Paper text:
The species with a higher mobility was named [name] form I, and that with a lower mobility was named [name] form II. The differences in the observed mass of form I and the theoretical one for [name] were quite small, and its isotope pattern was also similar to that of the theoretical mass spectrum. [name] form I was eluted at a lower salt concentration (~158 mM) than form II (~180 mM), which suggested that [name] form I and form II have a difference in their surface charges. The pI values of form I and form II were estimated as 5.76 and 5.64, respectively. The overall structures of [name] form I and form II are almost identical when these are superposed, showing 0.145 Å rmsd for Cα atoms of 233 residues, though slight differences arise mainly in the conformations of the turns consisting of Asn23–Gly24 and Asp155–Lys158. The C-terminal α-helices of [name] form I and form II also show almost the same structure in each other, except for the slight differences in the side chains of the C-terminal residue and the adjacent Glu235, where the electron densities at the end of the substituent groups in form II are more disordered than those in form I. The regions around the chromophore of both forms show almost the same structure, although the alternative conformers of the side chains of His148 and Thr203 could be modeled in [name] form I and form II, respectively. These observations support the fact that there is no large difference in the fluorescence characteristics between [name] form I and form II. Therefore, we concluded that the majority of native [name] exist as an unmodified form in the jellyfish photogenic organ in terms of the C-terminal residue.
Numbering used by the authors: 4 to 64, 68 to 238
Write the structure that this text describes.
């Protein structure tokens, strides 16, 4: 399970979306190195111009690449579900605007880790920050808290992403997330903890299609009192 992530793993991301009548598709490719919690991914809109801002799709576009420190090995649900994979479902509610409903399956196809996503967008304002592309092209860091879900054999998370807006304000995107294994093999159900994420957005100067370059680092954290005792 975890042994599938000891080296660099090629990643493929595929999303099909429909946001207020606008149908679109995105393909992403890169690689993950879970030993450093490092993701390098480049996304291309294969249907033309993206109808929503790129930053709003960052969370939707593979937490199995998070760095789980050795003392937290027993809490890494995402890798324990591999190679069969897990389903990741989200609702993302944008304050004073519409919402996304996403469903993804993340699993290995051979050596490639594949994230296949369906996105539906509803009730957006045609003049709002999303459909109006009024978000800044950047991304803040966040701590995502993970909890187990015994009765559904998986985990859940909820967190509020802060998106910077052109006019100086901040647009909150409230995420509710649920992950469940695809396989029937047992998986690690974690103790409460969090994932510390940082993301940098950039552009490829040679890319003519609408696109996003993403560099991301994720580390699991929060289980500390045991280690701290060693240094008293």
């Amino acid at each position: 399970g975890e042994e599938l992530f000891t080296g660099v793993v090629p990643i493929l991301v595929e999303l099909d979306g429909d946001v207020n009548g606008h149908k679109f598709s995105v393909s992403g490719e890169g690689e993950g190195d879970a030993t450093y919690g490092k993701l390098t991914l480049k996304f291309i809109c294969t249907t033309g111009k993206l109808p929503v801002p790129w930053p709003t799709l960052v969370t939707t576009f593979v937490q199995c690449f998070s760095r789980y420190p050795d003392h937290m090995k027993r809490h890494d649900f995402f890798k324990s579900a591999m190679p069969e994979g897990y389903v990741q479902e989200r609702t993302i509610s944008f304050k004073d605007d519409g919402n996304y409903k996403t469903r993804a399956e993340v699993k290995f196809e051979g050596d490639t880790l594949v994230n296949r996503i369906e996105l539906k967008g509803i009730d957006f304002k045609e003049d709002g920050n999303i459909l109006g592309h009024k978000l800044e092209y950047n991304y803040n860091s966040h701590n995502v808290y993970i909890t187990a879900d015994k009765q559904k054999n998986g985990i859940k998370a909820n967190f509020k992403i802060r998106h910077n807006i052109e006019d100086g304000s901040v647009q909150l995107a409230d995420h509710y997330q649920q992950n469940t294994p695809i396989g029937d093999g047992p998986v690690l159900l974690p103790d409460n903890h969090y994932l510390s994420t940082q993301s940098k957005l950039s552009k490829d100067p040679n890319e003519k299609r609408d696109h996003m370059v993403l560099l991301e680092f994720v580390t699991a954290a929060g289980i500390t009192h045991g280690m701290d005792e060693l240094y008293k």
